[PDB]
Amino acid sequence: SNSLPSGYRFNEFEIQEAIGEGGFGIVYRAYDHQLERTIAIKEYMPTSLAKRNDDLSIGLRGERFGKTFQAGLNSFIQEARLLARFSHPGLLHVLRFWEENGTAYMGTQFYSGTTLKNLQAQQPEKIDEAWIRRLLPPLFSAINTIHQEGYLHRDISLDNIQIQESQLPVLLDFGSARKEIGNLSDETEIVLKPGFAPIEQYTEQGPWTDIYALGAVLHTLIVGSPPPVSVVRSIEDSYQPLTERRPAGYSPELLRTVDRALALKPEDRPQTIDEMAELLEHH
Numbered sequence: 001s002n003s004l005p006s007g008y009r010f011n012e013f014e015i016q017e018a019i020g021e022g023g024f025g026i027v028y029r030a031y032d033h034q035l036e037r038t039i040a041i042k043e044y045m046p047t048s049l050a051k052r053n054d055d056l057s058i059g060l061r062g063e064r065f066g067k068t069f070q071a072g073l074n075s076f077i078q079e080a081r082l083l084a085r086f087s088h089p090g091l092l093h094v095l096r097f098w099e100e101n102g103t104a105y106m107g108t109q110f111y112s113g114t115t116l117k118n119l120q121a122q123q124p125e126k127i128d129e130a131w132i133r134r135l136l137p138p139l140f141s142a143i144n145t146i147h148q149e150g151y152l153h154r155d156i157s158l159d160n161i162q163i164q165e166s167q168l169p170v171l172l173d174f175g176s177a178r179k180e181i182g183n184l185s186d187e188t189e190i191v192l193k194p195g196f197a198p199i200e201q202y203t204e205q206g207p208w209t210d211i212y213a214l215g216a217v218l219h220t221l222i223v224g225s226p227p228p229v230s231v232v233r234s235i236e237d238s239y240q241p242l243t244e245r246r247p248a249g250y251s252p253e254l255l256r257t258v259d260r261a262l263a264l265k266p267e268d269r270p271q272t273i274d275e276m277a278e279l280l281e282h283h
């Protein structure tokens with residue numbers, strides 16, 4: 001682990017535990033001693049570019065990585081600014097942003113629970129149609145709020161949807177820094193998410209781009225894995241509609257909603273979140 005230790009201080013903030021560590025940042029449970037509340041802190045930390053120094057600042061692993069490191073940092077800042085536009089229960093709420101230690105930090109609201117990816121791995125028996133139909137209204141609302149302000153998410157999968165103990169979802173992360181680093185470094189494999197990214201993301205984008213990825217999330221919850229990579233589908237579509245697979249315990253109405261979200265071409269999908277939600281009605 002490259003994480004700051006428990007007890008580390010940023011003025012009034014104290015690190016309590018590193019609770020998430022990926023290749024591009026570290027998430028900490030932390031405590032604000034001024035406001036006496038638990039928060040999360042997200043630290044930009046691209047491990048392929050940078051390492052932890054003895055004084056716990058961040059330094060480049062090689063001088064050739066400086067431009068890509070700074071571009072990732074700039075994208076991290078821009079993502080914090082985008083999230084700072086919203087005050088919505090289903091979108092990560094940005095409290096704090098600052099630069100220190102050669103990197104950058106976002107202080108955010110602390111959310112209970114775990115990611116949808118971890119819930120699906122640990123308690124797949126909890127995920128049934130009734131649970132999915134309770135998940136969708138707040139998840140729809142969160143995505144639609146992004147869309148209504150003129151933005152797209154473009155990185156939806158199970159990994160960046162938090163499921164709180166209340167079961168309410170939170171969108172945590174748009175992958176901006178990761179995706180910028182991948183584009184600049186020709187590490188294409190960290191830019192799009194195979195099976196979740198629709199065809200128009202591989203090089204025309206709009207709400208239907210996020211709707212496809214949400215369809216792919218739902219497909220993963222229902223049958224356990226995402227649909228085929230969209231570029232492979234565009235050559236020869238081996239996607240088997242869920243209405244034909246008929247997984248046990250799932251209604252044609254929900255299965256058809258997933259299939260429509262996963263329509264290969266953008267124009268054949270629901271065009272807005274509201275359109276997709278309307279598909280779940282009439283039953």
Ligand SMILES: Nc1ncnc2c1ncn2[C@@H]1O[C@H](COP(=O)(O)OP(=O)(O)O)[C@@H](O)[C@H]1O
Binds near residue numbers: 109110
């Ligand atoms: N604002 C937040 N509040 C609470 N948890 C968060 C917040 N932002 C991110 N997380 C958590 O950070 C984790 C990031 O990656 P994860 O896969 O857990 O790494 P690790 O392999 O170290 O467990 C996720 O589990 C997610 O639940």
